[PDB]
Each structure stands twice: as C-alpha cells, then as structure tokens.
Design a protein around this ligand. Structure first.
Ligand SMILES: *O[C@H]1[C@@H](O)[C@H](n2cnc3c(=O)nc(N)[nH]c32)O[C@@H]1COP(=O)(O)OP(=O)(O)OP(=O)(O)OC
Lengths: 128, 299, 188, 30
C-alpha cells in the first residue's frame, strides 16, 4: 500500500532530487522492507551489508509479496530506530549486485508495544 | 536437567524419537539427517547423506529399523536406521513434497502428498505408485489410520479429507478449519487425529466406524502462525494424555488433552518452532525450531 | 544563503504562489523541516505553526495530509505544543478522523496522543468529544497500523472507568436506546 | 472456491521461491 515508489520532481534545488513525501514519526519504523534484490541467491551478503550499520534482530525473505520477475523482497529488523534511519539514508538507491535497491519503512509489521516505545523515544529525543 | 542441541547449519524442520527411546533423528534445510543418543552425553551418531532437496518430514517405522524422509527434491527416501545406508526413494511425484507417513502393523506401505495436488500410496517393493488421489489444491500433511484402510490428508483447502483404499472415493470431509492445514497426526489408539492450521486453531478430530458426523471433538488455543508460513506439526504423547504443537511465537505449547489447559508454554527458542516430539517412554520433549537448536525438556 | 533566511524564503514562496502543486512542494519541505529539533525555533519565530493550522483549513486533500504530517512531528515540543493548543486548532484535528486517507488519520491520532499532558491537564476534553466513539470503529479496522494506533491511543487518552462509560455510550448508540445526560459513573 | 484457487497459486509461488535451487545449502559458486 504505502510501499509504492514515489517519483522525484527551484526551491534551492539540491544535488539529488527528492520525491514529495513527508515523514511522520508513525510512518518511520524499525522494520525495513527491501525490494529489488536480484534473484541470484545473495540472501546472506545483503544481510551482512546491512548489519554493517546496526544490529539486525531478525531477517527473513517474504516470498508472498508481489514482486517483479527474478526479483526479491526482504525484511530486516533493526535494534535501534536511529540505526534503521541511517540504514535507509545510506542504502537506498545503491546499486547492489546489478540491481537497483529500494528500501522503505514497514510500519505494518510492528506490534503495539513496539509502537509504544517508538513514540516514547520520539518524545524523549524531542524534549531534549 | 536440560540438554541443548548444536550442529545443524540450517533450519530444523523435523525431529523424531526412535520407537525404543534410545536415539533421535533430526533434519531440515541443511539436507542432513542427524542421529543422536538420547542418553549418555547426547552424542551425534551418524549423518545421512543423499538428499538434494531439504528434508521436510521424518518418520520411523514402528520397528525403528526404517526411517522415511520426504524431501523437496520430489524424492522420498527410505533409510536404514542401523547403518545409515539408503534403501529406496519414491519416484513419480511432481514438484515439492510436503509429507509422508508410513503405515504400521501391516505390509509395508507409505503415503505421500505434494504440491502437484496428489496423494500417492507406495509399496516400497514396487518402485512405482500404487494409487493416486488427484487433488487440485496442494497437499501438506498425510497419515494412515491404524487399520491401514484409510488415508487422511490435510491441504490448503481448509478441509481434512479421508480416502478409502478399496473404493477410492472421498469418504469423509471435515470442516472446521478456516485456513490451511499444516500438520496431521493419529493418536496411538487410532481414536483421534490432531491438526494444526494457519487459523491458529489446534483441533482434535475423532475417527471411528460409528461417529457423530460433527467430529470437532475439542479445540485448543495458544498456537500462533505468522509471515514465515512454515509448516507446523503436532504430536501426541505416547499415552494420548498430552498434546504438543509448535508455533511461530517461540513457544512450545503443551496442552491437557481433556481439560485443554496449557500445561507448558516453553520459552527458549529464538525463532519459530517447527516440530515437537515426545519420548516414547518418559516425559521428555524434543523441540525443533528454525533457530537450529534442539531442546530436551523433561516434565 | 542562511538557514533561517532559507526558511523565510520558503515562507514567501508559499504565500505569493497560487499553484497547488508548488504549494505541495512547500508543505513537503516545511513538514520535513518540522522534524528537525533545531529548526523548531526558526519555525516558531515565523508564525508557520499557524501557517500549518490555516493549511488544514484548505480543502486540497494532499495539502491537508501534508499539513497534518508536519504537525505530528512538530507538536511534541513543550513550547510549540502550547502555541498550537492556544490557537484552538483541536477541532481542526478532530475533523480529520473522518478524513478519507489512512495517513492523515494516523497523523491526527499521533498529534492527539502528543498533546497529552501529565497531571490530567487535557484529558477531560477528550471525554466530552465524540472522538472516542469514532476510535472504536478505527481500532477494529483492517489496517494493522491503525489498530495499533487506536489501542495505543486508548491507553494514553482514556481511563478504565472512562472506557467503560465510552463503551456503554457506543453500545447505547447501537442499541438505539437514549441515555440520560445527567447520569454519571460513581467512584467505588 | 475462486479464492481457494488464488490461494493455491500464491502458495505454489511461495514454495517455488523459498525452496529454489539457488538457495540450497552448500551452494558452490562455480
Ligand atoms: O525531505 C525529503 C527527505 O529529506 C525525506 N526523508 C528521506 N529519508 C528520510 C528519513 O529516514 N526520515 C525522515 N523523517 N525523512 C526522510 O523525505 C523527503 C523525500 O525523500 P526522498 O529523498 O525522495 O527519498 P524517498 O522518500 O525514499 O523517495 P521514494 O520515492 O519514497 O523511495 C525511494
């Protein structure tokens, strides 16, 4: 639903163009959904590359997800949401094994208490 | 107590206990079948090699001399438990095979189900399928009654089906699952058949010559399925008093077959649990999971 | 050029234009600067909180969604939170539970949750409002995120005694039988 | 009925994906 890949555009235009999309605290998650991996059996190299950034609690490949041909979709659970943001920030639109790589937040998967801590930590950071 | 299990490289999907309670067999995604000493220092005896696909289901025959192994490579192997030599692999099936049950107390028979929608009856001495029950929906789990007359099959149609070997007809349909059935198993008495399903319902069904025509004998709860869509299997205790079924929430659930109270919820699995087995003599549970480790819980 | 000067330039760009898409870009940039802690003050000195509050009043759905998103990350700071409350924008947020889009509703819920103050400063307002009745339908919706938000919202802005009363009121509406306004729950 | 067929197709897709040969353990590169 929210996983659709929006498109880019003076406004003092920067080096790289950005699509119009505002990120709210709820939108952001610690579940990171990666789509566009080539279907060449790189399950473990991708996960190592992402584990470079933070610590990965859980990773699995969700095959039910509607994907294009010879292409894969993966889930990554991080430990700290700031780590998830930096992982998106740097990994998104990085050529990976011959394919464009698209990472999006996956808030559907997180449970009620996970949302509780997300919101509470957002309040903690904003207050200080 | 508690003994931990290490050695597996990939997810463990199934594990069984030898009929005489002296050894364990385990296998999963790593295509190896490992044998273990139940007592001593819980040592690893041998490794069965020869499956090219992943091992989806193990069984022992009632004598504990033959070990049956359904693999994703469309082949069902028959193994010698004593030497570890391969005996014979079933041929005929199309695509991935989900499960295989070996008939007890009768001349050697084997039943299989696969993603081709069919259920096949094998005589290990023929090297060819004996009967075929074509099902449009992929078949996930299959078991014989104690009389070796009927075949019980669980698929993705939410309907457990019973087949008559002589008539070759759809004898029985059981309604009561709202979603795919992933694991079936008969009571040691022949009296009751245990089912897991993606609807998070564990349901016992009673199969008898004289039945009530609405055999939803009991329903249990606790057992969760999730995005991993792993096949989930359940087992009866040796005496039919306890019911164990694995879940995707890291807990082994054990219930009281009568009152339906949760006797055990056992944390200690980092990932999803794929099969739970009871030792044939003593209250010992082997829990196998996707975290590649086994536990030998004692009750 | 200068950060605060740049934000002021965006404010001017927003005000002078009339093309709804060139306002879409402005509300995107503003809502995403609102995520910044340091840029809060810079926004506080330029009346752009009231810019957002006016922008919800506009009827372009995308623009309203952007404004709500900007609010959501913006409210939680104590200075900014008090300004928005004083404006009287709360009914503007209340109007957004009937907004059609999922995102806007989620943003509104988050903003309502954030406006929550310790010492029971604002809880009383929620009980009077019919928002609670709307929430029950939302909690049991198909969207997992919405369900999580609704349940979380109930703990934050409701009370067990209050919830029972709310449930009864919701039940009464379904029942079709009127409940006297004068009657109230009694402490035990 | 029809949703049963769509579910069966989706399950077949999932099995043809997760248990593909390319994911088999001990995958030699050569
Ligand atoms: O304002 C820009 C950008 O700064 C902001 N954004 C990107 N990544 C973000 C994050 O992790 N957290 C927040 N709060 N904001 C973040 O979003 C807009 C536009 O984003 P883009 O640079 O276009 O990236 P993306 O949103 O992923 O583009 P898309 O079409 O959705 O997918 C590649």
């Amino acid at each position: 639903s929210l996983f659709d890949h929006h498109v880019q555009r003076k406004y003092r235009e920067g080096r790289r163009p950005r699509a119009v999309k505002v990120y709210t605290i709820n939108l952001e998650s610690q579940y990171l959904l990666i789509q566009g991996v080539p279907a060449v059996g790189v399950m473990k190299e991708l996960v190592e590359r992402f584990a470079l950034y933070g610590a990965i609690e859980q990773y699995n490949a969700l095959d039910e997800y509607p994907a294009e041909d010879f292409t894969e979709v993966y889930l990554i659970k991080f430990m700290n949401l700031q780590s998830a943001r930096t992982a998106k920030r740097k990994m998104d639109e990085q050529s990976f094994f011959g394919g464009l790589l698209h990472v999006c937040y996956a808030p559907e998967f997180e449970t009620v208490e996970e949302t509780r801590k997300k919101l509470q930590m957002r309040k903690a950071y904003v207050v200080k | 107590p508690i003994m931990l299990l290490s050695g597996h490289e990939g997810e463990v999907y199934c594990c069984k206990f030898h009929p005489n309670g002296s050894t364990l067999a385990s296998a999963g995604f790593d295509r190896l079948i490992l044998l273990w000493n139940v007592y001593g220092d819980c040592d690893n005896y041998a490794t069965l090699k020869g499956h090219s696909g992943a091992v989806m289901e193990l069984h022992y025959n009632t004598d504990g001399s033959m070990l049956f192994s359904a693999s994703t490579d469309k082949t069902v192997a028959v193994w010698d438990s004593e030497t570890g030599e391969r005996v014979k692999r079933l041929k005929g099936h199309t695509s991935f095979v989900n499960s295989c049950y070996p008939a007890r107390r009768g001349p050697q028979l084997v039943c299989t189900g696969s993603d081709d929608g069919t259920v096949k009856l094998w005589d290990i001495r023929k090297k060819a399928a004996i009967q075929t029950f074509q099902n449009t929906y992929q078949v996930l789990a299959v078991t014989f009654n104690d009389t070796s007359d009927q075949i019980i099959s669980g698929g993705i149609d939410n309907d457990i089906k019973v087949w008559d070997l002589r008539q070759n007809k759809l004898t029985y349909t059981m309604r009561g699952h709202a979603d795919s059935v992933t694991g079936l198993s008969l009571s040691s008495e022949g009296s009751y058949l245990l089912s897991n399903a993606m609807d998070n319902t564990v349901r016992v069904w009673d199969v008898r010559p004289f039945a009530p025509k609405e055999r939803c004998v009991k329903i249990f709860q606790g057992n969760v399925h999730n995005f991993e869509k792993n096949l989930l299997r359940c087992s009866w205790s040796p005496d039919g008093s306890k019911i164990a079924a694995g879940s995707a929430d890291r807990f082994v659930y054990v219930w009281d077959t009568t009152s339906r109270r949760i006797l055990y919820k056992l944390p200690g699995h980092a990932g999803s649990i794929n099969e739970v087995a009871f030792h044939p003599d003593e209250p010992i549970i082997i829990s196998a999971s996707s975290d590649k480790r086994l536990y030998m819980g004692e009750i | 050029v200068g950060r605060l000067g740049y934000l002021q330039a965006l404010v001017t760009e927003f005000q002078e234009t009339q093309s709804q898409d060139a306002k879409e870009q402005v509300l995107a940039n503003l809502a995403n600067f609102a995520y910044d802690p340091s840029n809060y003050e810079y926004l506080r000195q330029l009346q752009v909180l009231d810019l957002f509050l006016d922008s919800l009043s506009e009827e372009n759905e995308t623009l309203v969604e952007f404004a709500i998103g900007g609010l959501c990350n913006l409210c939680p700071d104590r200075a900014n939170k008090e300004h928005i409350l004083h404006a009287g924008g709360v009914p503007l947020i209340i109007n957004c539970l009937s907004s059609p889009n999922e995102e806007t509703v989620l943003s509104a819920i988050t903003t309502l949750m954030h406006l929550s103050p310790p010492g029971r400063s604002f809880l009383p307002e929620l009980t009077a409002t019919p928002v609670v009745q709307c929430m029950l339908r939302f909690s049991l919706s198909a969207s997992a995120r919405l369900r999580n938000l609704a349940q979380i919202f109930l703990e934050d802005f409701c009370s067990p005694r209050q919830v029972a009363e709310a449930r009864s009121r919701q039940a009464h509406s379904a029942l079709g039988i009127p409940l006297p306004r004068s009657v109230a729950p009694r402490q035990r | 009925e029809e949703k049963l067929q769509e579910k069966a197709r989706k399950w077949q897709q999932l099995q043809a994906k997760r248990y593909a040969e390319k994911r088999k353990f001990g995958f030699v590169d050569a």
